[PDB]
Write a protein that binds this DNA or RNA. Structure first.
Lengths: 82, 82
DNA sequence: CGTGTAAGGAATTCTGACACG
DNA sequence: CGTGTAAGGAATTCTGACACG
């Protein structure tokens, strides 16, 4: 159950994903991932979010807009619940 | 492999374990766990360290000195490698 | 449209110490 | 011996903006 527990701040994610804080916080602004937040506002990510970020980055490179990606991901969640 | 990846700063550990930063940093000073460190000195813990902390706290409550605990844990590592 | 940067501040962690015991 | 606290500073994150495009 460790995979989905939100426990690592943005700095760690930046390293694990090789992405800038600008990119990471933006994808979230595009509703591509929903990190948790501490009462003091610091964003908390889980290992699952770390991978989600790598998928987003992959599609971004392949010249894909967040919207398209946002849809792709949406389709993947309904099936997971099945 | 998420279980052992060092990714969460002391604040998160404090919450997950209900232990004070004083206790956590001390157990490490007693060589009861070895957190990673970022180049900027911030300590990094893994889910495995989180559990290790709960075992330490458990024995501490049962009136056990870190030394004894340190030994108990030592014995558990050799067997794991087997 | 995705992303880089400088800006000012708010919250986090770190270390060594004094304390009691 | 394990742990609480105040102290001063160093590093982290957050947000909104200007930029190009």
């Amino acid at each position: 159950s460790y995979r989905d527990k939100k426990v690592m701040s943005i700095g760690i994610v930046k390293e694990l994903t090789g992405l800038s804080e600008r990119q990471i916080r933006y994808y979230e602004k595009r509703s591509l991932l929903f990190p948790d937040r501490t009462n003091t506002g610091i964003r908390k990510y889980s290992f699952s979010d770390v991978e989600r970020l790598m998928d987003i980055a992959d599609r971004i490179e392949e010249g894909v807009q967040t919207s398209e990606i946002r849809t792709e991901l949406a389709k993947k969640d309904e099936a997971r619940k099945m």
